[model samples]
Every structure is written in C-alpha cells, then in structure tokens.
Target: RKPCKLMLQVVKILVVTVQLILFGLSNQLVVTFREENTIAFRHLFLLGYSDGSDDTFAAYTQEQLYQAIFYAVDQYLILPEISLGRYAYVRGGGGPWANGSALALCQRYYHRGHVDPANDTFDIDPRVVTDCIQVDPPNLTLKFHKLINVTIHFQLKTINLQSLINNEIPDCYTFSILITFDNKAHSGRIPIRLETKTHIQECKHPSFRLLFDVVVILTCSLSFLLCARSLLRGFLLQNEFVVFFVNGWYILLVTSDVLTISGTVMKIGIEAKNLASYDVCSILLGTSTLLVWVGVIRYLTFFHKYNILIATLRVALPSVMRFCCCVAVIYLGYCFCGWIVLGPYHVKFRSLSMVSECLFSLINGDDMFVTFAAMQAQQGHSSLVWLFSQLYLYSFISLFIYMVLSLFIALITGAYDTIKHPGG
Candidate 1:
C-alpha cells in the first residue's frame, strides 16, 4: 500500500506537469487575444483629435469633438483586420444646472455619417446643420458648465484573425469620453467598451489540446474521488466535520482538482465572446496550477530534512497572528487620523485604505521621501498643522520602522532559533 501510494503521488505530479504545460499555452493565447483587442480599441480611440492644450484629453468645443468623430470613423473604415458596421453615432449627455449640482441633458445626435471630413464652416452650413449634435453648452465656464459624456457608438466588423488561438473577438466598441470642467479640476478621459455576442470559439490545435485535456480531466476526477474517500473515512471515524479540518490537506487537494476541472472544461467548450469569460478562465487555470505546485510540499514533507519552513511557521504562527491583531488596532487608528487630518493636503491619505497603504509603504521604507517631500511642499514651518504633520510622520516612522518591525521579526526569529538551539 505504501509503495502504491508513493507511485500514485508520482503519477499525480507527472500528470499535473502536462496540465500545467497545456495551461501555459492556454494562458498565452488568451492574453494575446485580449491585448490585441485593447490595442485595436486604443488605435481607434486615440487616432482621433482628443488632444487638449491645457493638460486634458477631452474636446472642450464642438469643433474638436466632430473632428475626432470624423477621424475615428475614417480610421475604423481603413483598418485591415476589422471594418465599421454602421454609421458612427455621437451621443452627448449632461450639462450644467443652477442652485445645486444638476444637469441639463442633451439629445443624442448624428455626428459622423458620411461627413466627407473636408467641409468648411464659418458659422454653420446649409443642409449639414440638422445632422450635427449640440453637445457643448452655450455658456462654457469654469464655475459650472456640465459634467459631460460624449459617447460615440460604432459597430465593428469581425476579421478572420491572422493568428488563431480562438476567434474570440469584439463585435462593437463604444467610446465613453467624459469631460469635467470645474474650479478644482479640469480633466477628460476617453474609455472604450468592447462588446461581444454569442459565438463559439475553439482552439486551433484541436487534437493536441483534447488529448492532454482528457488525460488531465480523468486524473483530476479520480484524484477528487480519492480525496472524498479519505474525507468520508475521517468523518466516519471522528463522527464530526470539525474533528478532521486539522487534516485539511485533503480539502486543498480537492479544491485544486475542482479548479483544474472547471478551467480545463471552460477551455474545451470555449467559444466565448467578451473579456470576462477569458479573464476568469485564465484566473482559474493560473490558480489551479499554483495550488497544485504548492501541493508538492506534501511530497517534500516525507523527507524530514525539508520540513524547516513548515515547522518554523507552525511554531511561530500563533505569535505572528496575535502580534498582527494587536498591531492592526494601532494601524487602523493611524488610518483614520491620517485620512481626517492629512487628507486634504496629501494625495495618499485621501481614504482609509490609502492611509493604510501609505503607512505600510513607510514601514517598508518605500515612498519614504516622496511622502515627506510632498508634505513639506504642502505646509510651511510656522504653521501648527505643519508641526502636527511632522509629528505624525516622524512618530509613525519611528514606531513602525524601528520598534514594531524589529519586534515582529524577533518574534519569528526567536521561534526559528529555538527550533535550531532549544536553550531558551
């Protein structure tokens, strides 16, 4: 039985190796396809006239917006891989209101439908006047113009990809160009949304993938059954569920098998449209491989010499957790203080998580000078808040850098050192 079990473990490892290799091929293909789609979208979006003079990418005027619309449509029509499906529609929404923050909504209009891109206008042309959209408000001001969104919806043609892992590609893409003109800030961003429809995409190398996929599926399927058998035996002996989680290696193995199964299955039937399915499939495959590799420690544990890290952690785990729990209280206290006090002045302290991350970076001695320099730039020496800021920064650094981290490392090292020399 011992000999067979050892051989079985070897079999599992070897099978997982092939699965990992296959998954590598799967991952690269998915990533390449995803990246190409992004590049395609970016080319169409940025190829237009989104340039701004004052540190912005938004079109502040109607002329600029139409210029981009014409350019975008023109660019798409010329692309070798993809073609335009319909006449590009430029829709504008939201304008400034009085009293409170409100909007005067605008109608969606036809901006780019065979507008030859060579027409000159002093004020407005004859027949082409009704075809254009009125997105920008009349009184465009710094005080309050409008929170604007100029979205251009364009239908895209599918191309037979030169490289085919799967024909998973986008059907349509909408450009969401949002403009903000306010006292505090003036910025614009153009984000593209690629839409997909129902289509079955299959791997180009069908025979090669299917061969390994079937083998891996069977291996994991059997592995899961064996893990379940062991778990059931434990339940029968202990007569309770909680009694056996101490032996939770079975649980990890079971989960790994399940993930491997799911990811592999997704790839098998994987004619998926859109980014989510591919993204999720990649995640599952990646994590499954990671978990499976980690399970190698189970085999390594059989050799007593390889037990150092596991033994050290098992001994030091309690002290680490308790220390972290206590330290988190102080950490969270600093979080609220920094967010409330230093938030308005500094970039990193605007939110609780930001404050937490900022302090963490301070501990690691990263972003050390940037934080302090930015603080100094924000405040003068004579100010009371300046003193407070210095106190906060210096104290947090002194405590976490010199004291907390030293003690934390000591806690782990003490346990490890005891493992080696048990005089303590």
Candidate 2:
C-alpha cells in the first residue's frame, strides 16, 4: 500500500503489457509460417491432393497419395539446391517398383546408425556389398553446405474400408525423414530430424524472434528473481514462510513468473526438434498468459471505481461453486440416463462427454433444433426410446435451463446486492 509498492505494481504491469505484445507477435509469426507453408505446398501440387481442386488437401485416397508424393519428389528434385548430380543418386522411377540406378550411394558414407547383416535386403547388387561396411547400404545423403537430404519409404499394408470412406479425411502419413548433414566445420555425419508430416516443417527463428527472446529472458528472469527475494526474505526475517497458500495473491505472483519465464525460454529456442516442442510451448504460454491477464484484473483493485468487478467476483465465487456442485448432481443423473437409453438413436447422446456437451449447449439454448432433428432422422428407434429421450431432454432442460441457470445467476445477483447495500 506504500507509494513505492504501488510503483512496483505499476512497473510490473508495464513489463507484462510489453511481454504480451512480444508473445503475441512470436505466436503470430509461428502460426503464419504454418498457414503459408500449407498454402504453398497445397496449391503448388494441387493436382494430387483432393478432388475439391480449390480446397487443396481437403481429402484424398491412397491412389491420389502416390501421385501427390512422387509428383512432389519430381518437383523437389528439380529445385536448384536439389538435383541428381549434386545430390549424388538416381534410382529408376519404374512402377510396381520405382526402377533407378545408384550414384555416389555413399561417397565418404560415414554411417552412424541403420543396421544390417541379415537386415541388408540390398537386392540391387550383391558383389558391391562385400566391399563397404556392413550398415552402409541404405544411404542417400544431401548437403546443407552439403546440406544432404535423405528419403525413406514404407507402405501401409492394411486399412479398414468403413473407417477410411466414412470420414473422408486422408490418413495423416507421418513419415519421419532422418538425415546426416555436415560440419566438422565442412560437415561430419550429425543427426538432424526431418519431419515430413505432408510438408516441409522448418523452424526458422527471425531477427525479431531473437529480439523478443532476449526481452523475454531479461524481463521473465528479473520477475522470477523478485518473487524469490520476497519469499525467502519473509521466511528468513520473520521466521515465517509464504507457502503461497496465503488465501490468494500467491498464484498471482510466483506462478505467473515461473510459467512466463519457463515457457518463453523453451518457446524461442530453435534446435533440431523445435517443431516437436511446438505444442508444449503454447500451452505453457497459454496458461501463463491467462495468469498474467487475470492479474491485470486484480490491479483494478487499486482504484475504487474499478474495484467493483473484482469485489463482485471475489464475493460470488463460493456461492457459485456450491451451486455448481448441486447442479452437477442432477447433471450427472441426466447424462447417465441419456447416453445409455437414447444413445442408439440420438447422435448427441452417443457418448458421455458428448452427452455432457450437448446438454450444456442446450442449457445455453444453442443447437436446440439440431438435437431433436438428428433423433427424428433415425426412424429405426422404438417409440419407447424416443419417448424416453423426449422425457429426459424435457426434464433436464426444466431442471437446468430453467431452474439451474436462474438459481446460479441469483447467487451472483445476491452477492452484488449484498455488496451494494451491506447494511444488514
């Protein structure tokens, strides 16, 4: 409450606001990379991806997949950086087998992994196998300076007809291409992963990305240190530890710092698997962003006029939680009955989570017609089950949509009124 303490709060808010923009930019940049890569890869090779010529990768079959893949190979091989002579290989492109010959198959083929004594099913030529090392047969090297690109192949032998044709979504072929590129300064055989999840998923950190990274590191680390100082000082000076269960404000400080610090640190780094680390970095940033923005609302407490929202939120929470627990009892009962009884007929009630989501949607009065219409489409169900569905939906809507919602809103209204009047 001191003037300087308020200054500290203001300064912290400044840091958060700045970081939010940078974080936002970093996320947008990565997302732009994904979307644009999809655009080029899909559009350039539109011939092979889908029957919907404009939609690109909307759907395709195994027959179309071979066309998309080999055609892209032909396109890729023609690139100025990647051609047969510099690449050092040319195996035949014949069918039932892509017939081709071997060029510098392993010039100075320093093979680290890939095994064969019995695994070397090198049916191409037998006599040449006796000269090279045992594990060197399946080698195709491309250069980074010699940024050598390599290709691997495998085919799926089985798939269900019902599953494939029903969804119309292409099987996501996750072919992981592994390559050995160079630089013992020129280039030694080092492991670099190439994830071919249908496109070139390259992670290139931009100049601004590096700038944001430095800002993220400095601001996040300083904020973390500030929390550590307060926590340690409390324990050392007063023989009391702020275990962060201090009835709130605990999570608002150290937790936000840790997540922002940890998330941004991991998010900005580009190594071999920056692509794989993508999902994890986002959730951490997501949670931390959630915390920081939530704390922004807490800062509203500093001004009397602005504090009303924060006060209302704090007062309403306990009553709303209790009401929610009460609501869940009836909610669960309806879910169990609807998913089991009406499930065979109503697509909405086919599973527990779906049943729960459908009921919640109904509570919000969204898709109100779709549920009944989907059930109506199924003429196969008995009148008994239809009647049960009618009863279940009707009763649940009454209990929840009418009673539950009104009661829950009443809790917040009461809290607001109490805060407004406070005399009693």
Candidate 3:
C-alpha cells in the first residue's frame, strides 16, 4: 500500500512538471493580430465600414444614386494588370508605358508564375505554380486604393506586419475605425461599389446554413414532443421515477438544441464577409438568446409546480422549456466561439484547434472562463469583439427577465386550478 501510494505521488509530480514546462514554452512565443482597418468610399458618396455606419440604400432611391456608382465603377475600368488583348491593338507601343520596359519585364515574370490561357478555362499551370503561389490566388496585389482612405491613420496595437508578410495567416475582416458621412449633401442617391478580380469564389452565405439549423431543431423538437406526450399522458401525479424521466428527457432535448444552434452560429460568423451574412447571424443569435434562458426559467417552474393535478402540464412544459433553452445555449456557444476564433486570430494561428475548441467549450468544466483568461493573459484587449460579447451577456439577462414573466403566468394558472377545485 505504501509503495502504491509512493508510485501515485511520483506520477502526479511528473505530470505537474510536464504541464509547467509546456505552459512556459507556450508563453515564450509571441503572436500578431491582423484586422482590416481601411474605410470604403464611393465617389463623393461615403459608406464607412468597421466603425458602425447606419447608412443604407432603403432611405434613398436607386435613380437618385448614380454619380457615386459611376465613380466607384472607375476602379474596374482602368486595371493596370490585364489588357483583354484589345489594349495591344489600341496602344501603338503594345501596352501603356506605366514602367515602360522594366515594368514589362517584371510583369512578364509574374505572369509566368500565374497564367491566363487563350482558352476560356484559364487552367492554372501547375508546372510553374509554386506551393506558396497555389495556396493563394495568382493575382496577389488587389489594388483597392480608391476604397482605402489613408486620411485617418488606423491605430492597431497588436497588428504584426511580420506575420502578414510571411503569409502565416489566412484572412480577417474585423477593423476598429469606421466611416460616417452626411448623405443629405450628396446629389441623387449614393452608390457604394466594390470591384475585384480573383479566381476564388465567394463563400456560401450564412443564412443558408442557418435555415438548415432551424429545420434540424424543429424536427428534433417534434420528436421530443411526441415522445413526451406518449410517456406522461394519463399518468398519476406522485410518480417519482416518471417525473425524473421527464426532467432527464427535458435536459437532453434542451442540451441537444443548444449544441446544434451553437455549432451552426459558430460556423457562420467566423468567416462571414457580407451584408446578408451579418443579418442572418444577427437574427439567429437574437432568437438563440431568447430560447436559452427562457428554457432555464421553464425548467425551474416545471420542477417547482410538479404536483398531482398539474403533472401532465409539468411534463409537457419541461420538454418545451428545455428545447427552447437548448436553442439559446447553442446560439450563445456560437457567440463565444466567434469571440475566440476572431480575436485570437487577430494575433496568430498557432494552436488554432485548441483555441477553437476552447471557444466552443470542447474542453469545459467550472474553469472554462479561467482557462480563457489564462490563454489571453499576455495580450489584453477590449475591442469590438469584447463589446459584442458584453451585449450577448446582456441579452441573456433580458431572457432571464422574460423567464420571470413566464414563471408568473404558470404560478397564476396553478393557483387558479387549486382555488377552482377544493377537493378531487
């Protein structure tokens, strides 16, 4: 027994020492944050992204907006890269002398690396395609000088240019500063346009994914209801095991809904880059917010009011409440996941799996929040991501308020039943 205890102690010490060493090693490395802090402009028309712009075309007519559209379209007109073979016929010297012969030499070399065949497919030549070049699109330099306003110098603290240059990171869309302008001054409607030429296709929208999640939840909910109805219908009030079974199923249903919603939300916003995408995410998150805490309230109510006469109602109510909470919890999980993936990515992609798992609660216990704290100990920030997280927390509080209202209704109904029938 002494030897066994001694062996256990030795193993524990080894584990602790190993963990300390790993932690120390992790702390030694540094990470860089990447965020798009540039503002967009459309001729005299302005749409400030990143800061929080409230301007939308719904307030202005399409016919009213023409100058800004034309001006913004200018970027697509004069591209220095490709000539469409028509330029060769137009320009007497073959192409415009941007850099004359020297530019031609460099451009030719670059083109040699990336190809556009005479045939329409423009099959990317893999023979010349280097590993680094293939990883990204052929046309690396996307000139958006018209859109990128340099007037206001963006003050990003943790932006590491080194990581960008090395191509260690993939992509980011978050930025601190935004633009706002008086639309009243612009004649006609203001049109904001974004033009770019790249072989890569845009990602599928978040709404499409959200629609699928909604379907899944609804199906699961129906199944839960049917099972619940069958189990507790015509049952006695004082049945202990039945009550426990009902609660257990309620927990399962709610928990499953939460997991599904969270997974869906997490996948959507982590890579969203368009207006439609944001709208979908916002709606999903909001709905999720309502369901989770409301479910919690219903759970407590069902337990508290579990009596003989109200047993049937109690069983039904718990299932419904849990289903709602599951949806909400899942949505919250997505919010938390987005917070983790986006913010940490602003730093570096090292330990990405671990960070992503942490965000979604793959490794969760009582110390989940504490684990996050330790992870982000080196670089503390209170950016838009943090602000949004606080809002999500507030949303939960709002749900709690809604739950109180629901509880009150149940209490009133239960009291009414008791008063109406003195004895059964």
lDDT of 2 by residue, 1-424 (tens): 4334423543554565466566667567646745654464444333343445433342123343234334534444453254322221223221124332111111222233232437763332211110111121132223232222223322111112222343433222222222111123322333222222333322222177568666656666666565566545544644644333223244544665666555655655632356546556655655666665655545545654555544555656667678778777777877777777654665666677787777766676674666655554444377776675566556555656668657756964687586664423
Please report, in order, the local distance difference test score of every candidate based on alpha carbons. 0.51, 0.46, 0.34
Instruction: List, residue by residue over 1-424, the lDDT tens digit for candidate 3.
Output: 4323322222322332243233234323321121122222222123222333434532255333333333222312332233221111111111233322111111111113222335434443322211111110012321111111111101111222343565444232312111211232334343333321111222223156456445544543443343344334323333755687345334433443443344345344542553344345434533433443444344446555644443434543554476567655754565455455446433321345443544344323433344334333434355574554444434433454466445545644543454334224
- Scanning candidate 1 in windows of ten residues, the lowest lDDT window is 136-145
Using all chains and alpha carbons, the TM-scores for the candidates as numbered come to: 0.65, 0.57, 0.23
The C-alpha local distance difference test score for the whole of candidate 3 amounts to 0.34
Among all candidates shown, the one with the greatest TM-score: 1
Better of 1 and 2 by lDDT: 1
After best superposition, candidate 3 residue 124: deviation in angstroms? 40
Task: Sort all candidates by TM-score, best to worst.
Answer: 1, 2, 3
Q: For residues 216-265, what per-residue lDDT tens digits would candidate 1 score against the true structure?
A: 66766666666566656645655765555123456655665566555655
Q: Extract clashing residue pairs from model 3.
A: 32-347, 33-346, 48-179, 51-178, 64-188, 64-189, 65-189, 258-326, 258-330, 262-330
User: Can you tell me which runs of candidate 1 are displaced by over 4 Å?
Assistant: 1-25, 45-55, 61-148, 164-206, 240-246, 264-278, 281-288, 306-309, 379-382, 412-424
Worst 10 residues of 3 by lDDT: 129-138
Count of clashes, each model: 1, 16, 10
Q: Mind sharing the TM-score for model 3?
A: 0.23
Evaluated at residue 342, the lDDT of candidate 1 is 61
